[PDB]
């Protein structure tokens, strides 16, 4: 509706920081060289660096003469300023220390939460601003070897389960270098080696090279103890940035980027808008430099109308239509609400019966178990516009028994449904395993955990789940079956909106390069597809082949893209290779391709909890929704470098209010997912979920995927 002024985590930089003279040069590393000479890297390819000091290099190089700050493209101007700020004592190291004077590290169990600041420079129009963003690292205070109780057959299990986010810090090194453990390509098997020679060698290596003194040696042995030959070596690589290094679990600790991922921890890392604001002001007061302003910048933003919140609606079997946003005599019954779909996969027309499974975690108290089955019984009834299984879902043996019992009742059946009540304690892995295995049996499942069961009860009937939750449970199940249970009072100015995800994996007669999810201009998901690709030549995915297969695959699925207008999106920035690949598919098929960078991982924060969007540095930041329950500061989606591709030609465009509206709508298609945390446009979000399921061994039922069944979500 109206505009508003909000404080953001940027502070104006004084122009007196701009360097008088810049020196261009053409040829440890080139990045470190540029850095040591108080400069940056211009052309990573042609090894072109720009320095503000007299280049000192005992190697070959040709000075490309001097240059002025005005000639550098914006990106490099900001990068050069970032480096200059560091020279005045304003860097992540210094300011992270200042932050910890106010927000101290805190330990939970064996883990320590470490606050620090991530810094960058943004050029708004003619000015430069320093972005100071508070983040957190989660570091084990126990070595990986100690964490797994020195058991080889527990260590490998650890690596596999935390594979996606686990990093390992070599605390036995003065550089505390961080690594990423290597894995058996296309698998979850970590690359380990029980060769005692490897272990002895690298263990001794640390001592010889870093603590070669009686005193340092003593401390080393006090801290890590003698070499444990029973531990295998971990093949890994640098986390920063092809080399591969060996690590000893006895000398490394697991580390995690909090923002990239328990309960008590999660809390501590979530900072309310006012807390971040204050902490930043504290750091600013402690910074004894005039090179940057002393207060945080404010910016005028555009609010988003409450009306744009009611464009998605559902209806009952009568004639009532209400938008997703939630006395009568019948309000006493446990009957679930009635939802009348706008579209139902034609598949259900033929289907005979649909077996119904109620899976109860034996760990749940009897009364919780009874509550759940009664909730599920009513959910299935409304589901229509029974086998009860009780086992120890927190044990591998219980899960195996469930699958066996269900497979036995599903033979000769086309589709089944499983409603699962489980304790909150189950690992993410066990939940995923349960769901994937049931699906191999053509059984779609819906999980309701103990937390929802105990804390979301209707105020007027404690033996009934909340009305809000009930609607969303019904929405979730319906979406898993490809049902168009809602209608969008909006039309996208595109033929199709497509989300893609690039993640190489190998499957039985497949070798898949990624996925793609398609929605029509009406806001309905229609097709979900894997993107088969041949073996890669160079260390890079051939996007021309990728997109060509995307188009051909959709055709196999009954949708021809050539001659149409589509919005194509991915998680993050559109790479040069992806643009080429898109120019390729544009000319070859006469596809008018509109695309842009959709960035969820950036450091910019607006200290207000409300829906809005604003232009900063040429990019648009959009907060799709405010935090209604959880603690924390909203994370904006960053939109930038929009472009149009016609007949193989690229024309850089400008982001419009309409574009922000589209992204906004696409972000509101969460399909019942309680606790709206989907920070990405639905097409992209689901593409990523599908790519994940394929990498996790989920069966690929093209029959279901062709009707938009989100069964893996």
UniProtKB/Swiss-Prot annotation:
SMART domains, per database record: Piwi
**Protein name according to UniProt:** Protein argonaute
Residues in Piwi domain copies: 416-699
Residue ranges crossing the lipid bilayer per the database entry: none
What residues form the catalytic site here?
501, 539, 571, 688
Can the keyword DNA-binding be found in this entry's annotation?
A: yes
Q: Where is this region: N-terminal domain?
A: 2-140
Q: Does the keyword DNA-binding apply?
A: yes
